[PDB]
Symmetry: C2
Subunit: 61 residues, 2 copies
Amino acid sequence: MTKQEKTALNMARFIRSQTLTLLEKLNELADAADEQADICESLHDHADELYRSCLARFGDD
Amino acid sequence: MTKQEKTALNMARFIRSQTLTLLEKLNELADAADEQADICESLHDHADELYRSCLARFGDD
């Protein structure tokens, strides 16, 4: 892939990892952050979908 | 807010900022990352919704 695509792929990997870390933190606050943990769950799945879409488009090459 | 809520709010702010940076990068690659830029657009809006939900729940106090 190009260098510019590699930066974007690396950034998508990082965001997926940070949204998982934040989901864990919101889940640890239990009832105090319940709605927020539910939104973040969907955010993490959305981050994972973006990362896999970038890997598929820019990789194997 | 508590210290634990402040960590989660700060993390949600950071993720919102990183998803905007990644959206700009994917938009700069134009047709080469078009589907990915469309997914990331929705990701950034989702990140913004999470941050505003955390600010509303944990703030003004």
